[PDB]
């Protein structure tokens, strides 16, 4: 009786939101950006190849200096690379080799990683002893760790396969805030540039916008037909892009609270693993299961170019803070650095 | 490299590269095994001599100059197809089925079919274990095998009843390149390490033959 009545009210609320979004859907992003000229063909060459991982690379993250990057592989090794020289700065042996994510702190003093061990491990890079040591192991998730991102040296946000995201106080080792509401495994998260909000994509084919300080879900974004594997904020923080197993990328707007554009091709039938934006946001780079990385025109939904330099899945990618280069990691155990030439 | 500090930085990088190869060579000498089965199918005590080294439980032991790493993924209640590709490079899969539980018998059959025909385990062999065969023989008297398998029409003897269950699992394999190593074991059996070692040795030879170019 009471349960049946309440679940009917939820359907009415869902229709109210759907009608509200349709009311403000006066135009389409495709129509708005029809007049602007295309970006042309984007040609990028492999400037660097980072060799030394002996297993599938699962994650990479640039440091804020746009020169150092950290990559994680299931050979049980965290490696920090000097991308200019291809020198290995550090090699961190992981206690658990089943790593799925890695993050570089914006200060450059810490890196984080974690996987099927349900733990986010914090590593101190600047010690008087001259070696990298574990500083914290964040326990509390009951599923695998899928993504992690530092807010500062003391706070980090983690998404897990137990359908929840958490905000952690690294110094105390306790999760100050727990973000609940996803009905499937949360596979990725992206921080807003001001680090006041973050979006997460789960296996319920939905993206939720969370307030870090308040600790509740502000908005929910649907439209994908399969599990979301990747998510990335637009450089101004007013939009984000997702990648799913349905071979599509969608651009959602925070303020319009709806999808604006879909990035899919008929030839593409494989899942998407990673998404990122260029510094101006005009390019959307997505890694695919078909061993390729497709560069999309964010405004016009045109495939600008292809990065074909891997013999297995492109598992991760990232663009430097200065926008100079893009790194692609792959299951073939190699990292490649790409940029164009005049 | 030109600078004095860059030369030492390059030397540090080379020292790191050397240790990565040494670790990788030692890592490739381990036999990694993925342990699967029902919720209670005897996978916890599949080997007596093995010792543990919500998350993934890794168990390791050494048998006849061969190091075996057994990974139990039963603690992961999340979606399996989001993390099952992490074991794509597994040497073999150990699948445990309890013959004394008819309610979970059909659960194992559909679990076996998905793993056997998984896109990441096409060329991965399976070491099927049918545990509690002594309890199955004792319980086959009062409870016929037709309760769990209505289509079963063979004799009710213990030898044929166990063989019919084994043939049900091997029928799930649709790839001729995959080899399934079935074994009937008891609760008090203490030679399961030998059965795994014999099955892994056959798999290694097939891998070696591919490595030496004969295949």
């Amino acid at each position, epitope marked *: 009786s009471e349960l049946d009545q309440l679940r009917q009210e939820a359907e009415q609320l869902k229709n109210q939101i759907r009608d509200a979004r349709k009311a403000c859907a006066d135009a389409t992003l495709s129509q708005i950006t029809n007049n602007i000229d295309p970006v042309g063909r984007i040609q990028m060459r492999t400037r660097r190849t980072l060799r030394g991982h002996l297993a599938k690379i699962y994650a990479m993250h640039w440091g804020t200096d746009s*020169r*150092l990057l950290v990559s994680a592989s299931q050979d049980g090794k965290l490696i920090i690379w000097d991308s200019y020289t291809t020198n290995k700065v*550090h090699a961190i042996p992981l206690r658990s080799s089943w790593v799925m994510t890695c993050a570089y702190a914006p200060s450059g003093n810490y890196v984080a990683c974690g996987g099927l061990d349900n733990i986010c491990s914090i590593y101190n890079l600047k010690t008087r002893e001259g070696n990298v040591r574990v500083s914290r192991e964040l326990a509390g998730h009951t599923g695998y760790l899928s993504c992690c991102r530092f807010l500062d040296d003391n706070q980090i946000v983690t998404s897990s396969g137990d359908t929840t995201c958490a905000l952690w106080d690294i110094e105390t080792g306790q999760q100050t805030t727990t973000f609940t509401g996803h009905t499937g495994d949360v596979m990725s998260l992206s921080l807003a540039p001001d680090t006041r909000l973050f979006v997460s994509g789960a296996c319920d084919a939905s993206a939720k916008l969370w307030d870090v300080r308040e600790g509740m879900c502000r908005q929910t974004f649907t439209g994908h037909e399969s599990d979301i594997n990747a998510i990335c904020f637009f450089p101004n923080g007013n939009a984000f892009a997702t990648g799913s197993d349905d071979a599509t990328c969608r651009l959602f707007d925070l303020r319009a609270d709806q999808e604006l554009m879909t990035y899919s091709h008929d030839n593409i039938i494989c899942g998407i693993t990673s998404v990122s934006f260029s510094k101006s946001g005009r390019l959307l780079l997505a890694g695919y299961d078909d061993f390729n990385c497709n560069v999309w025109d964010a405004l016009k939904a045109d495939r600008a170019g292809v990065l074909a330099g891997h013999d297995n899945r492109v598992s991760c990618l990232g663009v430097t803070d200065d926008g100079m280069a893009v790194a692609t990691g792959s299951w073939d155990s190699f990292l490649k650095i790409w940029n164009g030439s005049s | 490299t030109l600078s004095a500090e860059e030369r030492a930085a390059l030397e540090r990088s080379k020292a790191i590269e050397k240790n990565l190869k040494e670790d990788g060579i030692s890592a490739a000498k381990d036999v990694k095994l993925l342990l699967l089965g029902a919720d209670n199918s005897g996978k916890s005590t599949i080997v007596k001599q093995m010792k543990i080294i919500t998350g993934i439980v890794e168990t390791h032991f050494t048998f006849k100059n061969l190091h075996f790493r057994l990974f139990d993924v039963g603690g992961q209640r999340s979606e399996r197809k989001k993390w099952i590709h992490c074991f794509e490079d597994v040497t073999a899969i150990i699948f445990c089925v309890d013959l004394s539980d008819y309610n979970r018998m059909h659960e194992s059959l559909m679990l076996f079919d998905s793993i056997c025909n998984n896109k990441f385990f096409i060329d991965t062999s399976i070491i099927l274990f049918l545990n509690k065969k002594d309890l199955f023989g004792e319980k086959i008297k009062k409870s016929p095998l037709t309760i769990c398998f209505p289509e079963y029409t063979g004799p009710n003897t213990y030898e044929d009843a166990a063989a019919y269950i084994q043939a049900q699992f091997e029928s799930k394999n649709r790839s001729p390149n995959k080899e399934i190593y079935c074994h009937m074991t008891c609760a008090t059996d203490t030679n399961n390490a030998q059965v795994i070692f014999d099955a892994v040795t056959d798999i290694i030879i097939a891998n070696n033959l591919r490595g030496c170019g004969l295949y």
Partner: single-chain antibody
Amino acid sequence: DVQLVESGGGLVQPGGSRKLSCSASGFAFSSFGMHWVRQAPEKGLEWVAYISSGSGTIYYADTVKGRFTISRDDPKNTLFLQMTSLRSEDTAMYYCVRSIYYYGSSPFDFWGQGTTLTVSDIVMTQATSSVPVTPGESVSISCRSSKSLLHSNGNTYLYWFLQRPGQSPQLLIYRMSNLASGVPDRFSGSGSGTAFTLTISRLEAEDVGVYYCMQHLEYPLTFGAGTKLEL
């Protein structure tokens, strides 16, 4: 805590041999390159030798090459300096210095207490030998080099050290602008090409001492004469 204890020094006869030891505790010794730096009484610092991490690279100063041998024992965390044919020119306090080299590292960050031995090339210039200073006032120290210390990679391999009276040298500024760990922000390093300035805003009692500028552009590493601050 990070420690570097030297031993084996003492009064030796001319033409003799002596073995200096540097025991390391509290840090990953095998990860650090090691230097021997000596300081003649009432004189500036003089670099002696260098052995890299992993013992693959070894450098000596010309004045000691062929007579001194530098070695390390990584399992025992001990650094050695075997000296032969000791001359009266070798009478100095010998310091054990750790230095690790990777992108963004701070070489020469920790120095040992030193051991005293008594026997019976880019030119770095610090023309101002002494500078009278008062607490709370800003002080600038100048250093010059015969060659440009700016490398094509953008780094300027100039270092600043402070040796307080009775204490071992401490790193202040590495690569001409970066501030060493544990150093107050009042110290600032500024330079261009061959001319460099160390500015000390709001001078305090602890800042009193001798300041040395060292170049690490190439071997042999050379020190300036040193500028002393006095009240």
